Write a protein that binds this DNA or RNA. Structure first.
Ligand SMILES: [Mg+2]
Ligand SMILES: [Mg+2]
Ligand SMILES: [Mg+2]
Ligand SMILES: [Mg+2]
Ligand SMILES: [Mg+2]
Ligand SMILES: [Mg+2]
Ligand SMILES: [Mg+2]
Ligand SMILES: [Mg+2]
Ligand SMILES: [Mg+2]
Ligand SMILES: [Mg+2]
Ligand SMILES: [Mg+2]
Ligand SMILES: [Mg+2]
Ligand SMILES: [Mg+2]
Ligand SMILES: [Mg+2]
Ligand SMILES: [Mg+2]
Ligand SMILES: [Mg+2]
Ligand SMILES: [Mg+2]
Ligand SMILES: [Mg+2]
Ligand SMILES: [Mg+2]
Ligand SMILES: [Mg+2]
Ligand SMILES: [Mg+2]
Ligand SMILES: [Mg+2]
Ligand SMILES: [Mg+2]
Ligand SMILES: [Mg+2]
Ligand SMILES: [Mg+2]
Ligand SMILES: [Mg+2]
Ligand SMILES: [Mg+2]
Ligand SMILES: [Mg+2]
Ligand SMILES: [Mg+2]
Ligand SMILES: [Mg+2]
Ligand SMILES: [Mg+2]
Ligand SMILES: [Mg+2]
Ligand SMILES: [Mg+2]
Ligand SMILES: [Mg+2]
Ligand SMILES: [Mg+2]
Ligand SMILES: [Mg+2]
Lengths: 172, 386, 63, 103
RNA sequence: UAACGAGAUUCCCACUGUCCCUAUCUACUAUCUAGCGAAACCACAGCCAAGGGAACGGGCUUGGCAGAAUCAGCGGGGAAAG
RNA sequence: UGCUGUAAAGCUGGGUCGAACGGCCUCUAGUGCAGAUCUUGGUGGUAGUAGCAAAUAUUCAAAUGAGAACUUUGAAGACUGA
RNA sequence: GCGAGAGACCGAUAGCGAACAAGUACAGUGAUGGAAAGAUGAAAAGAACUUUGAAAAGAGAGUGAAAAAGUACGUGAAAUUGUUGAAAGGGAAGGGCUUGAGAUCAGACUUGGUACCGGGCCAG
């Protein structure tokens, strides 16, 4: 399998994947962007506080007509949520990549979430029933998630040279 | 087409936007115009709305059918412990308006006013005004220099005063700090008065006399989001109207193809800043007086407090102001009492009030006694009395 | 862990409704092993399964 | 500080149930009692004795008593080092009773 | 034309929030959260005033102006959708 | 990556890929798409939005389980009310 | 119908409706109506084993010419989308012309001839 981003030094990196996960893509994109570039331990503590509603995930792109909260002030937003299913899937993938780094001999206190991204997975179809005998779509929008933990002359003209030389001769 | 019939507009366009006040403390938009020949005096005071009561009064209004006859009147009690003067600000006249030049503070500020400058006082090192307090080191020439600057350049001098909210039954510990303009005398006179009043208490009886007409600055009672029917007093639609009736049926003509600012719309009601004028002072009571609620006709030794205390306020153990009628705000609200901005010589403004009696029955129910002694005299011994 | 069958069998063996069958909460393993009506009869006789008393409708006020 | 402790409290369930949906008054008395034990014992792990559940529900979904006398024990436990155990105290009247440490 | 009538109509008594003139209260919503998650519709899009113009402009011309990201409501406009 | 042609287009560098394909002289046609409320397939914005509100009502504990508002058992509170 | 040979025919939305368990699945009381759906690799060699995880899976490893072929299989366009990087942004954006800035590309010291002859481009 090919990751979207290859690590610069593969010997100091560990990766994890989750494909066809039946979790909301939009929520999972927001929770991945909330911990992109963080220390692994800091992000793990943060995701625990999100599950405990002590802190929130800022919703930045897929946030139309969602509620406002005071727990978004930390990130300079008003729209934030606490997506538990997405947080749990991301925590599972962080746990897996940390196990892979330990199996590589890397140090967990130095690990940083250097790469994480969410792609659309193929939809899962269902049916909903509508007024006047109509059928509509009731699809799921699943997620692919992947992540990587990384341990932390001048050439002058003839007259430009002439001016430079004559200026040196003025200064003795 | 024109309206079939004429009717006045619902509500006033002079109180827009109907939004929440930016602060809970009402701010004096305008102070009384300064007259140099008068003595140096404060123009406003801060108090707390305790509650309402009832009085009986002999009317002095010749030509009225109630002249020399008893009237029963609603009154408002404002708990007003003395304010402490802690600072002074100088203002300069500029082609762009008044501009604060300098603020000089007193050496010592009490904890209740220093809590004003904190959102998290309990987690703080409480460093406010410590270096400034050091500015008074053994000569205070920085302070004298700033005071001389105010004397030399300021045209409007305002004092900084805070309430002693620890003397009220409120659980809030932050004092309320406000600028009160000093009127009367020269600028130098005003600066000398402020300096000599640094860290001193100023009472209500030095700002307001009885029978005065004063204005009240306060933020009214909040009601949250409200529909047009009660926000603007519009007519309810018929009972059989689809999708509801507490609406305005037509919110505009086809053109202008926009909703106009003059149409009543649902939104936040109450909690507005209001300036209410011409409230007569029926009493400037004293906290040390044990007969606050007693008059010359009711000699019952009696405080202003009703039986069981003011509901959701407590007892008024301080100096107080008894105002005629109703003032904006709720109980416990900080209220700004301002002197009148004009000279009223009407009989309502110049009438001398002599109270007959002040109601001190319980406000927590249909109270029927003015005093526990009266209650015991009426009912006799109870089982709990043994 | 799922005594639904045992309660249905006990109701049929005792002859009462399922609402009157008491399965000993401290004997879950033994009841879970009672796969037959014979074993249900044995537990009923031992007191592991109890027929609960009828809820009283007194006729005293009517009388 | 002693981590293992038993005390008897009176809880005013009447003001905590003021205005509450009638079909939610006993469930909310359960939640108010849990929040009461967290307030006093400092533990978010609160366990209710089934005899306490019977006393709460004794008069139906809206028959919760005005005052209940509770015995609350902090005991060693997990993700929570301690827990609070609430069980009822049978008393003649629930009035005039102060908080008491049970030794 | 007695009787009958969820037939049409007028008057009277009783009655009342139909109204004067509104106010208050309950449950379920709406609201906020976890999970789940459609559809209509969609040239491009979306601030006004006047002008001219297929004679009623979001776009053109001339002006007024104009500061991220937004939430609950709302029914003026989109000569809104079907 | 560029070059050529007014243009329709032709050629070329790099990457990907894996079995056929082109220039020129002619022949032939089911031979060139932006539209047809076109056809079939696929995908958006809307949008984490509308919403998931009839039928009185659930609660405590134990068991099981990686995981229990929803499973099982016990205790209670209710309802259908022949 | 049975058996054969062919073509300037079509090349999986084409060619019969049907290249496949197609007159099938499925609908309709019924007469009838009636699809979609081909392609790993030469060969399953279809990933032993270790490790994290409740598991699905992941990470190592292994097979293979290739896993940028893993059965959700040749190639793998566009719409639409994530991440990284670059840039711009006061009630749309997009376009033409012109120049600046930044990036990319190109070219005469030529297939130059013998210190010199002479040449190329930009300018006075
Ligand atoms: Mg919202
Ligand atoms: Mg439906
Ligand atoms: Mg139907
Ligand atoms: Mg008119
Ligand atoms: Mg209201
Ligand atoms: Mg109707
Ligand atoms: Mg009262
Ligand atoms: Mg209520
Ligand atoms: Mg009939
Ligand atoms: Mg149009
Ligand atoms: Mg216009
Ligand atoms: Mg015109
Ligand atoms: Mg238009
Ligand atoms: Mg313009
Ligand atoms: Mg509406
Ligand atoms: Mg409209
Ligand atoms: Mg091949
Ligand atoms: Mg050829
Ligand atoms: Mg054709
Ligand atoms: Mg097309
Ligand atoms: Mg065309
Ligand atoms: Mg079309
Ligand atoms: Mg289509
Ligand atoms: Mg919603
Ligand atoms: Mg509904
Ligand atoms: Mg019943
Ligand atoms: Mg075909
Ligand atoms: Mg076909
Ligand atoms: Mg294929
Ligand atoms: Mg290959
Ligand atoms: Mg391949
Ligand atoms: Mg492929
Ligand atoms: Mg694309
Ligand atoms: Mg804007
Ligand atoms: Mg350019
Ligand atoms: Mg350039």
């Amino acid at each position: 399998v090919r990751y979207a981003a290859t690590p610069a030094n593969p010997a100091k990196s560990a990766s994890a994947r989750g494909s066809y996960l039946r979790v909301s893509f939009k929520n999972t994109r927001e929770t991945a962007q909330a911990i992109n570039g963080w220390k692994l331990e800091k992000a793990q503590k943060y995701l625990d506080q999100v599950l405990d509603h002590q802190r929130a995930i800022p919703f930045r792109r897929y946030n139309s007509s969602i509620g406002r909260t005071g727990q978004g002030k930390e990130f300079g937003v008003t729209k934030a949520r606490w997506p538990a299913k997405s947080v749990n899937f991301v925590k599972d993938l962080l746990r897996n990549a940390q196990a892979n780094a330990e199996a590589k001999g890397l140090d967990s206190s130095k690990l940083v979430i250097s790469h994480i991204q969410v792609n659309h997975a193929p939809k899962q179809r269902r049916r909903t029933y509508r007024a006047h005998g109509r059928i509509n779509a009731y699809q799921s929008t699943p997620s692919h998630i992947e992540l990587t933990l990384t341990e932390e002359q001048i050439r002058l003209n003839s007259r430009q040279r002439g001016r430079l030389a004559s200026q040196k001769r003025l200064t003795a | 087409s024109h309206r079939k019939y004429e009717a006045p507009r619902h509500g006033s366009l002079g109180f827009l936007p109907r939004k929440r006040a930016a602060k809970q403390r009402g701010r004096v938009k305008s102070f009384p115009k300064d007259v140099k020949s008068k003595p140096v005096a404060l123009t406003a005071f801060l108090g707390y709305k305790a509650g309402m009561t009832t009085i009986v009064r002999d009317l002095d209004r010749p030509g009225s059918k109630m002249h020399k006859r008893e009237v029963v009147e609603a009154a408002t009690v404002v708990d007003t412990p003395p304010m402490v003067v802690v600072g002074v600000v100088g203002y300069v006249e500029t082609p762009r308006g008044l501009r604060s030049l300098t603020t000089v503070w007193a050496e010592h500020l009490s904890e209740e006013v220093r809590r004003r400058f904190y959102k998290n006082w309990y987690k703080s090192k409480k460093k406010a005004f410590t270096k400034y307090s050091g500015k008074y080191a053994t000569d205070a020439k920085q302070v004298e220099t700033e005071l001389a600057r105010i004397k030399k350049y300021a045209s409007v001098v305002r004092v900084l005063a805070h309430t002693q909210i620890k003397k009220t039954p409120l659980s809030q510990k932050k004092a309320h700090l406000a600028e009160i303009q000093i009127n009367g005398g020269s600028v130098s006179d005003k600066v000398d008065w402020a300096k000599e009043h640094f860290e001193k208490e100023v009472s209500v009886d030095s700002v307001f006399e009885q029978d005065e007409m004063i204005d009240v600055i306060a933020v009214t009672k909040g009601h949250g989001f409200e529909g047009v029917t009660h926000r603007w007093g519009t007519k309810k639609l018929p009972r059989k109207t689809h999708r509801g009736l507490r609406k305005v049926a037509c919110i505009g003509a086809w053109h202008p193809a926009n909703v106009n600012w003059t149409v009543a719309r649902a939104g936040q009601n109450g909690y507005h800043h209001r300036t209410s004028i011409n409230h007569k002072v029926y009493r400037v009571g004293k906290g040390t007086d044990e007969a606050n609620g007693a008059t010359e006709f009711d000699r019952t030794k009696k405080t202003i407090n009703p039986m069981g205390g003011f509901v959701r306020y407590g007892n008024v153990n301080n100096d107080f102001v008894l105002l005629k009628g109703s003032i904006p705000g709720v109980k416990k609200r900080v209220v700004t009492l301002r002197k009148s901005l004009y000279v009223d010589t009407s009989r309502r403004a110049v009438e001398k009030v002599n109270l007959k009696w002040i109601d001190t029955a319980s406000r927590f129910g249909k109270g029927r006694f003015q005093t526990p002694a009266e209650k015991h005299a009426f009912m006799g011994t109870l089982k709990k009395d043994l | 862990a799922n005594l639904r069958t045992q309660k249905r069998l006990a109701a049929s063996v005792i002859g009462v409704g399922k609402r009157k069958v008491w399965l000993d909460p401290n004997e879950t393993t033994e009841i879970a092993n009672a796969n037959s009506r014979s074993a249900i009869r044995k537990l009923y006789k031992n007191g592991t399964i109890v027929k609960k008393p009828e809820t009283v409708h007194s006729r005293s006020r009517a009388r | 500080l002693q981590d293992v402790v038993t005390r008897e409290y009176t809880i005013n369930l009447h003001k905590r149930l003021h205005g509450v949906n009638f079909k939610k008054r006993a469930p909310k008395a359960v939640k108010e009692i849990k929040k009461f034990a967290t307030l006093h014992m400092g533990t978010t792990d609160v366990r209710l004795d089934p005899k306490l559940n019977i006393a709460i529900w004794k008069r139906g979904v809206q028959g919760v008593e005005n005052r209940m006398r509770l015995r609350i024990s902090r005991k060693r436990n997990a993700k929570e080092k301690l827990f609070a155990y609430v069980e009822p105290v049978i008393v003649p009247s629930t009035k005039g009773l102060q908080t008491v440490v049970v030794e």
